[PDB]
């Protein structure tokens, strides 16, 4: 058998984007743009996305050993409704909360920083090969954890590279489409995958 | 037939590069560098590059829903002559206007921003596969538009993902080497391709 083990998985991440804009006398310029994929915590994936189909308007995560907190449009936390993404040929289903990127208002001879947090959830096809100790996603991101890792019936003996607190298993999980199933959740440094 | 449809195409883009430099008491350091590929508009590709073989010293384009304008060395707009790129084994012809990257002058305990705009034009080999609704370039960039899309003889029915204003077709186009031909032009978010 040379065909890799194929299974369905769902990704959850927020496209944190903070851009620096320089406002000249008659023009505007981007002095710097910082794009980062912030993962979604288990509490939000369960109690907000799966339970109500909404994402928090803020991205709280760890990056370079710092608890960074990004706010969409620098506004207070608010529940944003998830909507389907733009149509694309030969692509799996995907949803997002924001479409237009935010930038600061125009103030003369001044630098300003405008943060944008766009919650994104996508259904990706995961692939794995022998010894099945890790799997990849349709986006090309590697996940160093066995697809069968878990706490039940000896699954704890499978390979895993992330800490214990970065993995969560939920029994009787009823998937909400934006029967019970055993849902696994892993919070990678750049995204959260559920399969 | 498994061989992808191969055709010649020309790319046009400007390597906008703005870097932040911190000048210490006895050293210099890069506090941040922002590199972006700004596309070249149809007016410049026709009236400046093809008509006269020169590129504007400024990059005006849309990025993250903002009309950003970058100036080379923060100087006024000027016509820059295109010259061949450095020799490289197994590489298609390419030309550029700037070679040395610009940085701000040294001023003590101060941050400074220096913008660099280097117009670049290259001849790349485009490839496409059935249903031929999209094609890739030698640089690995995807173009979500059928290679045969156009306004003539039913070509408008081909697949296209970009807006109407992002595509332009010119008849009787005489290619200028830095007989008439039907030249297609598409302004992608990061580059402009002509085939």
């Amino acid at each position: 058998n040379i065909a890799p083990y194929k299974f369905k998985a769902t990704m959850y991440y927020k496209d944190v984007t903070v851009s620096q804009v320089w406002f000249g006398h008659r023009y505007s310029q981007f002095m710097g743009i910082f794009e980062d994929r912030a993962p979604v915590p288990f509490e939000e994936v369960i109690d907000k996305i799966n339970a109500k189909g909404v994402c928090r308007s803020t991205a709280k995560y760890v990056r370079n050993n710092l608890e960074t907190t990004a706010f969409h449009r620098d506004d207070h936390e608010t529940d944003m409704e998830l909507k389907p993404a733009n149509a694309a040929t030969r692509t799996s289903r995907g949803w997002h909360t924001t479409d237009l990127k935010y930038n600061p208002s125009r103030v003369e001879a001044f630098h300003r920083y405008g943060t944008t947090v766009n919650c994104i959830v996508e259904e990706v096809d995961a692939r794995s090969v022998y010894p099945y100790d890790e799997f990849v996603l349709a986006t090309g991101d590697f996940v160093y954890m066995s697809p069968f890792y878990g706490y039940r019936e000896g699954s704890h003996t499978e390979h895993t590279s992330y800490a214990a607190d970065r993995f969560k298993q939920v029994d009787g999980f009823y998937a909400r489409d934006l029967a019970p199933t055993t849902r696994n959740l892993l919070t990678t440094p750049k995204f959260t995958v559920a399969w | 037939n498994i061989a992808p449809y191969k055709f010649k195409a020309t790319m046009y883009y400007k390597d906008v590069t703005v870097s932040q430099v911190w000048f210490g008491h006895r050293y210099s350091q890069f506090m941040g560098i922002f590199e972006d590929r700004a596309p070249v508009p149809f007016e410049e590709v026709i009236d400046k590059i093809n008509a006269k073989g020169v590129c504007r010293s400024t990059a005006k384009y849309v990025r993250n829903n903002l009309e950003t304008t970058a100036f080379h060395r923060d100087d006024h707009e000027t016509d820059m002559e295109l010259k061949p790129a450095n020799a490289a084994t197994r590489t298609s012809r390419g030309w550029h206007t700037t070679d040395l990257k610009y940085n701000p002058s040294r001023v003590e305990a101060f941050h400074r921003y220096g913008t660099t705009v280097n117009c670049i034009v290259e001849e790349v080999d485009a490839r496409s596969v059935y249903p031929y609704d999209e094609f890739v370039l030698a640089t690995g960039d995807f173009v979500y538009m059928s290679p045969f899309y156009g306004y003539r003889e039913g070509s408008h029915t081909e697949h296209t993902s970009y807006a109407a204003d992002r595509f332009k077709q010119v008849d009787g186009f005489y290619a200028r080497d830095l007989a008439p031909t039907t030249r297609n032009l598409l302004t992608t978010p990061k580059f402009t391709v002509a085939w």
Binding site: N86, A88, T91, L100, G140 | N65, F142, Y144, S161, A163
Partner: peptide
């Protein structure tokens, strides 16, 4: 798929200015 992210999860033509 990676290059379709901008066309799938963002507006490419809308411009905002003040």
């Amino acid at each position: 798929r990676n290059q379709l992210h901008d066309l799938r999860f963002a507006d490419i033509d809308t411009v905002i200015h003040a």
